[model samples]
Target: SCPGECNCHWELFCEEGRLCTGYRHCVCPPSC
Candidate 1:
């Protein structure tokens, strides 16, 4: 499962050769 504790930040990961299609990434919270 995704990191529920972090915020979901959708971003482009074209560096992996996946094109403009992005991913749902998680960022650490300030509280952490």
Candidate 2:
């Protein structure tokens, strides 16, 4: 479930022998 009309970004990383995932707001510049 996400709030607002913005796109979401997910980041997956491994730390301390554990698999972790996190979610954040995706903000991209118009001129990439």
Candidate 3:
């Protein structure tokens, strides 16, 4: 779950027959 006003992004990856969850900042490039 995300906390405060910070942007959060989620990603799912499969490895070794298992699924994992990844989270990070969802900031966009200034050029975009």
Query: TM-score, each model?
Result: 0.38, 0.27, 0.26
Candidate 1 per-residue lDDT, tens place, 1-32, comes to 33577778888767566557778777877775
Best by TM-score: 1
Clashes of each: 0, 0, 0
lDDT for predicted candidate 3 compared with the true structure = 0.56
> For candidate 1, which ten residues in a row score worst on lDDT?
13-22
Considering every candidate listed, which one attains the maximal lDDT? Answer: 1
RMSD in Å for model 1 = 5.6
Residue-wise C-alpha lDDT for candidate 3, range 8-27, written one tens digit per residue: 46666557688776666575
- Evaluated at residue 10, the lDDT of candidate 2 is 68
After superposing candidate 1 on the true structure, give the runs of residues whose Cα lies further than 4 Å from its correct spot: 1-3, 13-18
Instruction: For each candidate in the order shown, give its overall lDDT on alpha carbons.
Output: 0.70, 0.57, 0.56
The model with the greater lDDT, 2 or 3, is: 2
Better of 1 and 3 by lDDT: 1
